[PDB]
Amino acid sequence: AKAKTRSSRAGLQFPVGRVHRLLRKGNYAERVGAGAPVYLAAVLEYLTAEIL
DNA sequence: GCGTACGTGCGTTTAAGCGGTGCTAGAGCTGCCTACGACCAATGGAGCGGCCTCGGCACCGGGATCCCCCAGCCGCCGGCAGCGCAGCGCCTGACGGG
Structure with missing residues (x-):
């Protein structure tokens, strides 16, 4: 079996796994x-993207 | 020092408040069934560590503004002092009266 990161599986960059x-x-x-975490990590990436 | 507008007071008046219905919605609880998150054992590679080299930024030096300042300068005007004068009340003539 092969493993894939969850962040990719959501199309996200932040570490959902962490x-x-x-x-x-x-x-x-x-x-x-x-x-819940998959939702959570998504929020942060939106917030961080907003500021820079 | 000015002045208005907000405090005080009076006189309506009306909607709050009380007490009274009558309802059912919705909260509270129970019974029961499911799935989903924790748990466990494996696995590898993403992330973190360790180097390590260019150039983005730092720094300089110089030239370039550019506001900041202000006396110069004049216009203006009003005050002001002097001058010409307009009007009036008295002064004083013209002429008859006293």
Whole structure:
């Protein structure tokens, strides 16, 4: 089997794979819906793009 | 120092407020079923570390503005001092009256 990054699978650049781990250790919740981080990383890329 | 407009007061008046219906919507809960996220074991390559070389920026030196300033300068005008004078009330003539 071959693996592909999730960021590409969303057509995104920011590290969905990394940021998902952050909420897991961030203790904001005990369980995270897998859909949430993909949404989250998308937001940041929009925000960062807006400023520069 | 000026002046208006907001405080005080009076006189309507009206919608808040009370007390009264009557309703069902929607929140609260339960039963029950599902899926989806955590967990585990593997895997490799994206990311992070370590070099390492050009040029974007720094810096300089010089020339180029360019606002900043202000006396020059005049126009203007009004005040002002002097001058000519307009009008009036008295002064004083012309002439009859006293």
